[PDB]
Design a protein around this motif. Structure first.
Motif, PDB file in Angstrom:
ATOM      1  N   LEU E 232       0.805  -1.211   0.000  1.00 38.44           N
ATOM      2  CA  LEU E 232       0.000   0.000   0.000  1.00 38.44           C
ATOM      3  C   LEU E 232       0.839   1.263   0.000  1.00 38.44           C
ATOM      4  O   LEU E 232       0.312   2.336  -0.299  1.00 38.44           O
ATOM      5  CB  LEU E 232      -0.929   0.013   1.211  1.00 38.44           C
ATOM      6  N   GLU E 233       2.126   1.157   0.311  1.00 39.61           N
ATOM      7  CA  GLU E 233       2.986   2.324   0.414  1.00 39.61           C
ATOM      8  C   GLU E 233       3.070   3.032  -0.927  1.00 39.61           C
ATOM      9  O   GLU E 233       3.354   2.411  -1.950  1.00 39.61           O
ATOM     10  CB  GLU E 233       4.378   1.890   0.848  1.00 39.61           C
ATOM     11  N   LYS E 234       2.823   4.329  -0.924  1.00 39.32           N
ATOM     12  CA  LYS E 234       2.910   5.124  -2.134  1.00 39.32           C
ATOM     13  C   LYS E 234       3.680   6.393  -1.829  1.00 39.32           C
ATOM     14  O   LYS E 234       3.558   6.944  -0.738  1.00 39.32           O
ATOM     15  CB  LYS E 234       1.537   5.455  -2.666  1.00 39.32           C
ATOM     16  N   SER E 235       4.467   6.854  -2.789  1.00 38.44           N
ATOM     17  CA  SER E 235       5.347   7.990  -2.583  1.00 38.44           C
ATOM     18  C   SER E 235       4.811   9.232  -3.272  1.00 38.44           C
ATOM     19  O   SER E 235       4.127   9.157  -4.292  1.00 38.44           O
ATOM     20  CB  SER E 235       6.750   7.688  -3.099  1.00 38.44           C
ATOM     21  N   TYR E 236       5.136  10.379  -2.701  1.00 42.11           N
ATOM     22  CA  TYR E 236       4.745  11.674  -3.223  1.00 42.11           C
ATOM     23  C   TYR E 236       5.952  12.588  -3.164  1.00 42.11           C
ATOM     24  O   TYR E 236       6.756  12.506  -2.238  1.00 42.11           O
ATOM     25  CB  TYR E 236       3.588  12.255  -2.414  1.00 42.11           C
ATOM     26  N   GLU E 237       6.080  13.458  -4.149  1.00 42.90           N
ATOM     27  CA  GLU E 237       7.258  14.301  -4.288  1.00 42.90           C
ATOM     28  C   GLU E 237       6.867  15.737  -3.985  1.00 42.90           C
ATOM     29  O   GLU E 237       6.131  16.361  -4.749  1.00 42.90           O
ATOM     30  CB  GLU E 237       7.850  14.170  -5.685  1.00 42.90           C
ATOM     31  N   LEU E 238       7.371  16.258  -2.873  1.00 40.83           N
ATOM     32  CA  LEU E 238       7.055  17.601  -2.436  1.00 40.83           C
ATOM     33  C   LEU E 238       7.593  18.599  -3.454  1.00 40.83           C
ATOM     34  O   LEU E 238       8.282  18.218  -4.397  1.00 40.83           O
ATOM     35  CB  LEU E 238       7.636  17.834  -1.047  1.00 40.83           C
ATOM     36  N   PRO E 239       7.282  19.889  -3.312  1.00 40.14           N
ATOM     37  CA  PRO E 239       7.812  20.871  -4.265  1.00 40.14           C
ATOM     38  C   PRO E 239       9.329  20.914  -4.337  1.00 40.14           C
ATOM     39  O   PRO E 239       9.863  21.654  -5.169  1.00 40.14           O
ATOM     40  CB  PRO E 239       7.248  22.193  -3.749  1.00 40.14           C
ATOM     41  N   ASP E 240      10.036  20.171  -3.487  1.00 34.21           N
ATOM     42  CA  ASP E 240      11.490  20.096  -3.531  1.00 34.21           C
ATOM     43  C   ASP E 240      11.972  18.677  -3.762  1.00 34.21           C
ATOM     44  O   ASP E 240      12.672  18.407  -4.737  1.00 34.21           O
ATOM     45  CB  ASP E 240      12.045  20.603  -2.214  1.00 34.21           C
ATOM     46  N   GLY E 241      11.590  17.759  -2.898  1.00 37.38           N
ATOM     47  CA  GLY E 241      12.111  16.420  -2.909  1.00 37.38           C
ATOM     48  C   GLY E 241      11.738  15.763  -1.605  1.00 37.38           C
ATOM     49  O   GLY E 241      10.606  15.902  -1.146  1.00 37.38           O
ATOM     50  N   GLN E 242      12.695  15.084  -0.991  1.00 39.36           N
ATOM     51  CA  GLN E 242      12.466  14.237   0.174  1.00 39.36           C
ATOM     52  C   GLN E 242      11.117  13.538   0.047  1.00 39.36           C
ATOM     53  O   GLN E 242      10.208  13.718   0.855  1.00 39.36           O
ATOM     54  CB  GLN E 242      12.589  15.005   1.494  1.00 39.36           C
ATOM     55  N   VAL E 243      10.993  12.765  -1.032  1.00 39.26           N
ATOM     56  CA  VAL E 243       9.750  12.074  -1.320  1.00 39.26           C
ATOM     57  C   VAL E 243       9.236  11.408  -0.061  1.00 39.26           C
ATOM     58  O   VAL E 243       9.977  10.718   0.647  1.00 39.26           O
ATOM     59  CB  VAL E 243       9.957  11.067  -2.462  1.00 39.26           C
ATOM     60  N   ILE E 244       7.977  11.656   0.255  1.00 43.18           N
ATOM     61  CA  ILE E 244       7.358  11.127   1.456  1.00 43.18           C
ATOM     62  C   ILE E 244       6.663   9.823   1.104  1.00 43.18           C
ATOM     63  O   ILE E 244       6.110   9.678   0.012  1.00 43.18           O
ATOM     64  CB  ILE E 244       6.384  12.146   2.071  1.00 43.18           C
ATOM     65  N   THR E 245       6.724   8.861   2.014  1.00 41.94           N
ATOM     66  CA  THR E 245       6.106   7.558   1.825  1.00 41.94           C
ATOM     67  C   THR E 245       4.910   7.453   2.753  1.00 41.94           C
ATOM     68  O   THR E 245       5.054   7.593   3.969  1.00 41.94           O
ATOM     69  CB  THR E 245       7.091   6.431   2.103  1.00 41.94           C
ATOM     70  N   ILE E 246       3.745   7.190   2.181  1.00 40.81           N
ATOM     71  CA  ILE E 246       2.480   7.193   2.900  1.00 40.81           C
ATOM     72  C   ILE E 246       1.966   5.768   2.971  1.00 40.81           C
ATOM     73  O   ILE E 246       1.831   5.099   1.944  1.00 40.81           O
ATOM     74  CB  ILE E 246       1.464   8.111   2.213  1.00 40.81           C
ATOM     75  N   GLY E 247       1.675   5.305   4.175  1.00 40.13           N
ATOM     76  CA  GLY E 247       1.211   3.946   4.346  1.00 40.13           C
ATOM     77  C   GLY E 247      -0.285   3.862   4.534  1.00 40.13           C
ATOM     78  O   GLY E 247      -1.043   4.210   3.630  1.00 40.13           O
ATOM     79  N   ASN E 248      -0.728   3.415   5.706  1.00 38.23           N
ATOM     80  CA  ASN E 248      -2.153   3.245   5.933  1.00 38.23           C
ATOM     81  C   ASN E 248      -2.891   4.560   6.101  1.00 38.23           C
ATOM     82  O   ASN E 248      -4.123   4.563   6.067  1.00 38.23           O
ATOM     83  CB  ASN E 248      -2.393   2.367   7.155  1.00 38.23           C
ATOM     84  N   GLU E 249      -2.196   5.670   6.285  1.00 37.05           N
ATOM     85  CA  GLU E 249      -2.956   6.904   6.302  1.00 37.05           C
ATOM     86  C   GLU E 249      -3.427   7.317   4.933  1.00 37.05           C
ATOM     87  O   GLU E 249      -3.977   8.408   4.800  1.00 37.05           O
ATOM     88  CB  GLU E 249      -2.161   8.032   6.941  1.00 37.05           C
TER      89      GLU E 249
END
Ligand SMILES: Nc1ncnc2c1ncn2[C@@H]1O[C@H](COP(=O)(O)OP(=O)(O)O)[C@@H](O)[C@H]1O
Ligand SMILES: Nc1ncnc2c1ncn2[C@@H]1O[C@H](COP(=O)(O)OP(=O)(O)O)[C@@H](O)[C@H]1O
Ligand SMILES: Nc1ncnc2c1ncn2[C@@H]1O[C@H](COP(=O)(O)OP(=O)(O)O)[C@@H](O)[C@H]1O
Ligand SMILES: Nc1ncnc2c1ncn2[C@@H]1O[C@H](COP(=O)(O)OP(=O)(O)O)[C@@H](O)[C@H]1O
Ligand SMILES: Nc1ncnc2c1ncn2[C@@H]1O[C@H](COP(=O)(O)OP(=O)(O)O)[C@@H](O)[C@H]1O
Lengths: 371, 371, 371, 371, 371
Positions: E232-249
């Protein structure tokens, strides 16, 4: 009013007026006394001859110099010299004229103090001032920077000046000069049989030196040339007759200036004390000093001394700088010429030591900012 | 009327008129005083030389800078500097011209207040204004956003600006600059025997730095290259002669900017204070700031500093952003160019501090919205 | 096995064994060569005299110093000095003794490199190590923090150490020392009438300095006291009778340490460089540095130096601080004492540089971790 | 057996035994490493100083905080902190003591997970538990309802509790605290002339803040008072002398808590986040919350903060409520006191997380009903 | 003549002309104001940006929403929003166009009254009318019977309608919507270390929610599968980087709609308020309502919400009834579609509130039969 300019030196007095192109009284700085008994009654002869008269009566007198190396050793003799200079050669009353005196760097202080005391108490001048010989030489040379090498008859000294500022920590003084060259020539002339021992044969040897000696551009090559040829051998005629022939000691005499070990001194030649004064100065005035190397004084009058000095300093300094040696024909009188210039400067009329200043502050007033 | 633009800086004064492409008076910000005695009477020499004349008389003077790190420490010296700038280099009457002054961020307030007081009381200008150096650099660069790194000779600072709004909480200031690089080079040049200690040999070392130093793209590889080869070793010729050879300290000098521990400082390199300023700004302007990283000031003139800065900031920032470093060839004069642009803007003619405003509100009027 | 501690210094060689309380051999670092010709056949005299012997034949020889300002200039006669030290003063074979040598901070690298090359190839010592002089001085003083001023005969330096960590960015080095004081005394005695020019008379002047000079607590008041009273004059007896008397010169000579402008230097006095080296250090350790100001070396031996320096540093520092000057009576041997202590540590026996270590890494191994 | 209450905080570690009236060990949570080279051989320097020792050796170290805003960023440093706390400050063996640890609301979960993993594996404690700081403050205050504002050194937060039930949707957390106040005070002192840049000067600035700062009751009136009078200025004595005098900086620093726009944050003051948490809470408990507003933590310790916050919250809330602010004198230790109370409670003895439970369920057991 | 259809809503203004298939102007209803200093003179920047322009300058502005929960709380901001919509996005003169506005059921009366007062006095429209959003959803859906769930961004409501008759006693309104889902997602993202506190970071979080969140069919089984696997983990790329990984939230966020206890609300989920509105209706109009359950608005756009709501309502309702949920793909714009349809109906032209009616009856004319 006019100021007098008395360049005492050590072995030749030069006096005149401030504002002239040359001194009007140049005579030896000797005082002679008769050494024989004296038989003709009514001769009424004097007890001490001063100046140029002693050189006429040489054969009868003992000649003494009152100045050894810049320093005055016989104050009564020096007072006689000054009296002769004021009254018989110049014919002026010293109580109406300021007097500018000269001195070499790094002399005792009592020399200068006693000189001032004499000039104010005995001769009663209105003002007086003691100047350094190298600074006055630089005035007469037309420069305002440059390292000056003032080789007189008592002392030799280098005084580096830049933009009118003197660098006292780089002042060098050497006690080798024309008197030591005369003594060395007297000594090495005995290899050919000529003997000059009297205090009045020293004057004959000084004349020989002046007229025949010269500086070799290369010492070993001239040694070999004299050993092989005879083309450099010259003759001289004594006051008695009996010509003498001078061989390779024509250039061994002034070579003592570049090899002071000849007379048993420890120090280094003039070419090397000049360079050491340079290298003791800063780093960003050395180029100007190399380019403005000024010669003055009688011992710099040898033929070839400028070319030799340039060859030596050029071999010493880095290979990328123009080394130039300024040697005017009127070298011997440069100190006096500069003294006349200085004393005529209108700006200078506030640097005199007036008589009231002295009367109130003692002879110690000589070492003040008028130093 | 026309306004003057005086970019005082710290170690180089740059002045001119508002509306020109370049300053017309660039000279060092030094005041020299003679340290030797001065012997030639009639020389009539001055007591303090300012600007480019002191660099000619280096070997005779003690050179002092009146600005340490942005901050002015000698107000009499700085007043002499300004008088020289107004009357001798520009030849203008300051009572007819507004004057725009520049200052670094995060200086004392008394610096700015006393500067204003001087400009109104002593020089009597009609108006004046104190501007920040980084903002003016951004004017001259043609941007309106971007993080500017203004490395002068006293201070280094980053000032992030976005859409014309500056973010004061993210302003960084470091006290490492060209003067500290000069001192470090003086220190590490002693490993090869060359000694520069005088206040006038610092100028020679600054010249060596400007002409031979460069930034290594990789420090360990250049260390090894210098240890093995000799292809990076270059020579320099002092004012005296005697060429000196510079080895690996060609790039150890400016490496102090990226490793301030070399001079015993605690802080981090310029590449890291730039990145920390970025990361202290918001999150949605960081991409623009990464893309508009502007360099100005003399200490950014080293060869290879832009490439090094880019390599470092690229290794720091996330891997998905284009990091770009703007380094014009006329970097050293960017603050002045921007100051001229600003003072010529017609919108700006209402931001001056007039003389009546000052007379009524005291020197405190400088910290108002004209800040 | 035991180690040798050779504090070659500059002007005195001090040698001995590690673990002793004082150096066993102390003699001047001088090489003399005869400058006259030599007439007696069968004298069998030698070509160069070294050390304490050369001071007996001082009148015949010309004395060289192989170390100028910390740095070694002549390497052949330095090998002579070391050979004399090993074989004639200590009588030890250096093939089985590790050797600890000292050096001043901020010296050329080739100095150390050639020193170790010689010690390993000419003398074949099994190990060696080069130490900094100020650190050894602190060892002998028994501190572990403190700012040490090590005034030798060629070089003066400050090295601030806290808790066993030296702060290299705050190390100061000054090239004013005992030999410059000797030269200033030679130059300053001239104004009283005495002339010392030979390298053999420089030793007499050094003796006069050691036995008669002192530091004035207040320079202007002492100058007035000498200008008025006569209770300052002391007399010295030259090697040939000829008593000489000196007044002002007694305290004008070591005052050059506090006013280096006397000898034409630009730098600041030892008190001001000590204060500046303290102010270069972090703000937290300045208390301990002020309270632990350690003196060592020969030039710190003048009576009154500690009181004068405490007065100066106290007038410089803030009023809250306790300034203390630590000046032991065995001051001039502190570097050697500390060197013996250090080489005597069991913890140190793995910090030597071995023979095979050198054979495999070249002379460059001196600057690496084996320091 | 007895439990250990370690309130690790962020900037101060407080440890002790459960059942005491106060923490036994209180020291900064700092790990220092030497940044200079270290010359004294044999003294055996160590590589990292932790705790109150790092503040003594502060002058030669780089001080790191292992915990930034509640969150631990350096796990090796934190293990050193805990090891020092257990063995060198309390002198206990953690294999035989349960340990209660404290954490702020709304932190990452890996923080707690790694914390308990370390406590069970590295230190082998028999049990452990992680509590919220605000709940423990409310224990130590003797309340069972009330909105607690716990301002530590990294994080500020409100936690409204009513009748023993906490309202999690109303918990507010703000990342402005004492560390940001120290940074603002540094940056704001720089405008008076003083500069503190190193991590060792950050501690001096923190001491200045604690000792001289206070909260103004009316910010504009205190600004005008400081602008007109001079009765506000105190002096402080740096660790080397050179007193500094600060004026309106005394109340301008902690005013950042009420106007976080000073440091460029967008959020609202503490007086406004408190009111917003109250207004998130249910309408029936807002009166009790208004009456039981509890302060704890070191940043709530300024003089005048209670009066200021009462004035603000009173102006915000309806005019018919009794606003009351509870600020005990032992505010700074409220979290630890409450922790001791809690761990000594007898009901609590079945709420520890045992070693068996951990070995059974992994570190995930921390977020279960055993919270 | 043509009518305008402005559907305001709480967080997305969408407007256009009556008779189109879609709005031609969709932009956020935000008004930004700069919060930083502003340094570039001549930038000429404005004081408030509205709409999509404020989204490009988030890093500089502080963003306000003028509508909290349906209700308008800032009338100046709302007037700016309307002015922008009329003149810059649409480019029409509002004095020649009737305007149809919408609002949610069960709002204050002054909201609607002040709205019409603005639209007549300020913008000077010839006619206007306010419509309920659910009715327009039902127009656009192509029905005349059904219970419509209109989840916007500030308010959710159910409005049951049968044969064109609305049953006002069964209307439910709930204040849980997309804004509360964004706040909850910001709050639970901090469990992984990401912190978004700024009003400009609220927009980043809203985009994250829109792009990644979905409704789980079975919440407990999805929690179990997220705990076990990692698919379920999916990544998102902020306006800079440090891609965040989102789990059950990813699915814990929109689950707040079905369990409002997550954000501390007392009410029941949307499925349960829908069923309660049904059972609140007549027992003769429940089968059609079960069969015509219409979703609209942006918060109904999560993947899986239709299937989830059908599962829940089917579990609630009797087994003999067929539940159906109508969820068009153009749900987000259904209110605007229906508004366009209604305003284009020729029957409607008698339902406008003319300007003369308003002038003669006051703003009370809005709740009258002119609804
Ligand atoms: N042409 C010359 N060649 C060599 N030496 C000379 C010459 N002319 C003069 N001298 C020497 O110069 C010395 C005099 O130098 P001088 O400038 O008069 O110094 P002072 O005035 O101090 O005596 C005399 O000893 C003389 O030997
Ligand atoms: N080409 C260059 N390379 C390296 N450094 C330079 C160069 N040109 C100038 N500098 C350094 O820049 C400094 C001057 O920077 P500048 O922009 O004048 O700042 P300021 O005006 O504040 O003095 C000088 O100290 C000089 O060392
Ligand atoms: N009692 C003293 N007073 C003043 N100076 C002294 C004294 N004793 C020795 N010196 C000076 O110290 C110098 C030697 O210092 P020293 O410690 O030997 O340094 P180094 O070992 O480098 O030669 C000599 O030049 C001498 O002039
Ligand atoms: N009297 C005081 N006035 C103002 N601030 C203080 C005072 N005492 C301590 N502080 C501040 O409190 C902070 C420490 O808070 P503390 O309760 O220790 O939180 P933590 O335990 O999480 O570090 C320090 O940064 C210090 O600046
Ligand atoms: N694809 C999507 N998935 C989940 N939520 C969405 C999506 N698109 C929009 N939203 C949410 O819908 C809200 C906007 O709804 P909208 O129809 O504009 O209501 P209003 O017009 O009343 O503001 C936003 O807060 C956004 O978070």
């Amino acid at each position: 009013t006019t100021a007098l300019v008395c360049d005492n030196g050590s072995g030749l007095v030069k006096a005149g007026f401030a504002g002239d192109d040359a001194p009007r009284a140049v005579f030896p700085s000797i005082v002679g006394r008769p050494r024989h008994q004296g038989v003709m009654v009514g001769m009424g002869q004097k007890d001490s001859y001063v100046g140029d008269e002693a050189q006429s009566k040489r054969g009868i007198l003992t000649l003494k110099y009152p100045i050894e190396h810049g320093i005055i050793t016989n104050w009564d003799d020096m007072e006689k010299i000054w009296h002769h200079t004021f009254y018989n050669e110049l014919r002026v009353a010293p109580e109406e004229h300021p007097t500018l005196l000269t001195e070499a760097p790094l002399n005792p202080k009592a020399n200068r103090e006693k000189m001032t005391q004499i000039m104010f108490e005995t001769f009663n001048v209105p003002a007086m001032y003691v100047a350094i010989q190298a600074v006055l030489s630089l005035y007469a040379s037309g420069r305002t920077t440059g390292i000056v090498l003032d080789s007189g008859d008592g002392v030799t000294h280098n005084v580096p000046i830049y933009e009118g500022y003197a660098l006292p920590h780089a002042i060098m003084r050497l006690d080798l000069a024309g008197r030591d060259l005369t003594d060395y020539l007297m000594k090495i002339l005995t290899e050919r049989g000529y003997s000059f021992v009297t205090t009045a044969e020293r004057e004959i040897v000084r004349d020989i030196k002046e007229k025949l000696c010269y500086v070799a551009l290369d010492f070993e090559n001239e040694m070999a040339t004299a050993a092989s040829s005879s083309s450099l051998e010259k003759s001289y005629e004594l006051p008695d007759g009996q010509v003498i022939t001078i061989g390779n000691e024509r250039f061994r005499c002034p070579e003592t200036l570049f090899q002071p070990s000849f007379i048993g001194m420890e120090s280094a030649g003039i070419h090397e004390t000049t360079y050491n004064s340079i290298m003791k100065c800063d780093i960003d005035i050395r180029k100007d000093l190399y380019a403005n190397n000024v010669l003055s004084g009688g011992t710099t009058m040898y033929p070839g001394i400028a070319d030799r000095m340039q060859k030596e300093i050029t071999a010493l300094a880095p290979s990328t700088m123009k080394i130039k040696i300024i040697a005017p024909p009127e070298r011997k009188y440069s100190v006096w010429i500069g003294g006349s210039i200085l004393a005529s400067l209108s700006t200078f009329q506030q640097m005199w030591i007036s008589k009231q200043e002295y009367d109130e502050a003692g002879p110690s007033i000589v070492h003040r900012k008028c130093f």
